[PDB]
């Protein structure tokens, strides 16, 4: 039903930056919280509600900033001061207003 | 009243489980009536877990949780809860993340014997500081004391009304003893890492449990003193409280040093004497709470609500806490019911 289009990954040097983006398909009344986990288990990076309530994983607080354009149901992840330990597949996700979770394919992020 | 032994007495010398999740309200759901939304996670190992309560697809801000405890098989359990007023449109869920899960799992909200037990958990955090240490004390199915190394007070804290009576000499002594328990487990973590040739960067868990049982005459029945490393049995006292049970060769070396030092005799004195003496004091001081029986309100799925104690007999779902001292249960396929509070 819902499709999450991801973009913005790739290779980057230590101390460099990257901006991930995730656009949700379907109606704007279909997705509330949007954000990212990163890869057995996956860990919370950052997410944001429709109203703008943000939450950050401990290992990225201060360096990463999530933002939202509600007019297009799309979120952005500004990843600053990247380290080799940030190398992972970053999975976009969204929650419906009925608490259904949707997951993107993910975008590889690699830091030299 | 915790054990009170010297530092060198209980020092050591020498399997992941995924959580079960239940989302429910404390009381039956009624629009406009203040309630409590519960997310009960249990049966998991290790203890690190991330639990969120969701309202209409976003995180609920002010969520409290119970203190970390564990069952006889060493698996942990926790209650996450928050006050909420349900309405017609609002939808609620619980999201749980754990090392055993490839992605966070979401569960939607579908709208006269006695004992004293102490549970201790210490988890190493390499680099991130000293180990996370959590201690809780129980009388029957009622928590009454707690200690968290990350909390601000650095004191043993009350969690039941009848224990708040106790004066400063009591709290000073329990605070002193629980800090010694923590110091023991920190050393034991460093000792066990070397005895197993494990890397200094890995996180490991040490668990200690002990307590005593009394009958309806408040006389001693049985005592326990058990110990686990990474959720597996390490060393434990046998039912007779004079000899040890060791799991592998590392625990057998600890067993010999403890047999030569006569550690079991000191624990036996506490479990048979001090443990029952203060359990009797607690049962008296908290008689209105601890000696009550609450009959299960009953209403193919058989329901049982708001009962105490937790022991009951009825797909069988785990008995769960309501968050107010009572318990709940239901079973799926006539339905048989058995509880102490019902004639």
**CB distance from B99 to chain A under 8 Å?**
yes
From B331's Cα to the closest Cα of chain A, the distance in A is: 26
Q: Which residues contact B13 (CB under 8 A, 6 or more apart)?
A: B191, B253, B254, B257
B57 and A41 within 8 Å at the Cβ level: the answer is no
**Local structure of residue B214 (DSSP, 8 states):** E
**CB distance from A98 to chain B under 8 Å?**
yes
Find residue B298's DSSP bridge partners: B304
Residues B119, B110: Cα–Cα separation, whole Å = 33
**CB distance from B167 to chain A under 8 Å?**
no
Residues B111, B303: Cα–Cα separation, whole Å = 14
Domains along chain A with CATH numbers: 4-111 (2.60.40.10)
Nearest residue to B84 (alpha-carbon basis) of B32, B28, B21, B22: B32
Report angle CA A78, A84, A85 to the nearest 5 degrees. Answer: 85
**CB distance from B92 to chain A under 8 Å?**
yes
A42 and B103 within 8 Å at the Cβ level: the answer is yes
From B90's Cα to the closest Cα of chain A, the distance in A is: 8
Burial class (CB in 10 A: 0-12, 13-18, 19+), B5: middle
Best of B16, B52, B58 to disrupt the A interface (most A CBs within 10 Å) is B58
Best of A99, A105, A106 to disrupt the B interface (most B CBs within 10 Å) is A99
A95 and B61 within 8 Å at the Cβ level: the answer is no
Tokens of B97: 């993340």
**Residue A2 burial (CB count, 10 A):** 15
Best of A30, A36, A41 to disrupt the B interface (most B CBs within 10 Å) is A41
Nearest CA in chain B to A92: B103
Nearest residue to B228 (alpha-carbon basis) of B247, B207, B246: B207
Nearest neighbour of A95 by CB, restricted to B50, B54, B97:
B54
Nearest neighbour of B58 by CB, restricted to A53, A101, A103:
A53
Q: In Å, how far are A24, B291, B311 from A31, measured between CA atoms?
A: 8, 50, 43
Residue ranges of A 48-87 with Cβ closer than 8 A to chain B: 49-51, 53, 55
In sequence order, what DSSP letters do the residues of A63-98 get, joined into one string?
Answer: TEEEEEETTTTEEEEEE-S--GGG-EEEEEEEE-TT
Residue B192 is inside which H or E element, if any? helix B168-195
| Beta pairing, strands A10-12 & A107-111 | parallel
A51 and B58 within 8 Å at the Cβ level: the answer is yes
B58 and A55 within 8 Å at the Cβ level: the answer is no
Nearest CA in chain B to A32: B57
In sequence order, what DSSP letters do the residues of B290-326 get, joined into one string?
Answer: HT--B--EE--EEEEEEEBSS--B--BPPPEE-SSS-
Burial class (CB in 10 A: 0-12, 13-18, 19+), B301: exposed
**CB distance from B57 to chain A under 8 Å?**
yes
Nearest residue to B317 (alpha-carbon basis) of B35, B43, B27: B43
Which three-class secondary structure state does DSSP give residue B42?
strand
Residues B66, B40: Cα–Cα separation, whole Å = 10
Find residue B82's DSSP bridge partners: B37
Tokens of B236: 């434990």
Residues B97, B80: Cα–Cα separation, whole Å = 13
**Local structure of residue B272 (DSSP, 8 states):** I
Nearest CA in chain B to A40: B102
Residues A103, A53: Cα–Cα separation, whole Å = 20
- On whether the CB atoms of residues A109 and A94 are closer than 8 A, the answer is no
Residues of chain B immediately before an interruption (C to N > 2.5 Å): 14, 111, 299, 314, 333
């Amino acid at each position: 039903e819902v499709k999450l289009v991801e973009s913005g990954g790739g290779l980057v040097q230590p101390g460099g930056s990257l901006r991930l983006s995730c656009a949700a398909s379907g109606s704007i009344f279909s997705i509330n919280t949007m954000g990212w986990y990163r890869q057995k288990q996956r860990d919370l990076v950052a997410d944001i509600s429709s109203g703008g309530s943000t939450k950050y994983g401990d290992s990225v607080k201060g360096r990463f900033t999530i933002s939202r354009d509600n007019t297009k149901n799309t979120v952005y992840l500004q990843m600053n001061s990247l380290k080799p330990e940030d190398t992972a597949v970053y999975y976009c996700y969204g929650l419906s207003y009925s608490n259904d979770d949707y997951w993107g394919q993910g975008t590889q992020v690699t830091v030299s | 009243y915790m054990l009170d032994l010297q530092p060198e007495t209980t020092d050591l010398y020498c399997i992941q489980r995924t959580p079960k999740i239940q989302v429910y309200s404390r009381h039956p759901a009624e629009n406009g009536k203040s309630n409590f939304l519960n997310c009960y996670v249990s049966g998991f190992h290790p203890s690190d877990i991330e639990v969120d309560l969701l309202k209409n697809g976003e995180r609920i801000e002010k969520v409290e949780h119970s203190d970390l405890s564990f069952s006889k098989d060493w698996s942990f359990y926790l209650l996450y809860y928050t006050e909420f007023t349900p309405t017609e449109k609002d939808e609620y869920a619980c999201r749980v993340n754990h090392v055993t899960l490839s992605q966070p799992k979401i569960v939607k909200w579908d709208r006269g014997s006695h004992s004293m037990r102490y549970f201790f958990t210490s988890v190493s955090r390499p680099g991130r500081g000293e180990p996370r240490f959590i201690a809780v004390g129980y009388v029957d199915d009622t928590q009454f004391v707690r200690f968290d190394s990350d909390a601000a007070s650095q004191r043993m804290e009350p969690r039941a009304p009848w224990i708040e009576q106790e004066g400063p000499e009591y709290w000073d002594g329990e605070t002193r003893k629980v800090k010694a328990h923590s110091q023991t487990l920190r050393v034991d973590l460093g000792t066990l890492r070397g005895c197993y040739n494990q890397s200094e960067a890995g996180s490991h868990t040490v668990q200690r449990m002990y307590g005593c049982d009394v009958g309806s005459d408040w006389r001693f029945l049985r005592g326990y003193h058990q110990y686990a490393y990474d959720g597996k049995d390490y060393i434990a006292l046998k039912e007779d409280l004079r000899s040890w049970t060791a799991a592998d060769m590392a625990a057998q070396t600890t067993k010999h040093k403890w047999e030569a030092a006569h550690v079991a005799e000191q624990l036996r004195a506490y479990l048979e004497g001090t443990c029952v003496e203060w359990l009797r004091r607690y049962l008296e001081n908290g008689k209105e709470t601890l000696q009550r029986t609450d009959a299960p309100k009953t209403h193919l799925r058989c329901w049982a609500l708001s009962f105490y104690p937790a022991e009951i007999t009825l797909e069988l779902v785990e008995t769960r806490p309501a968050g107010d001292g009572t318990f709940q249960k239901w079973a799926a396929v006539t339905c048989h019911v058995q509880h102490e509070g019902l004639p």
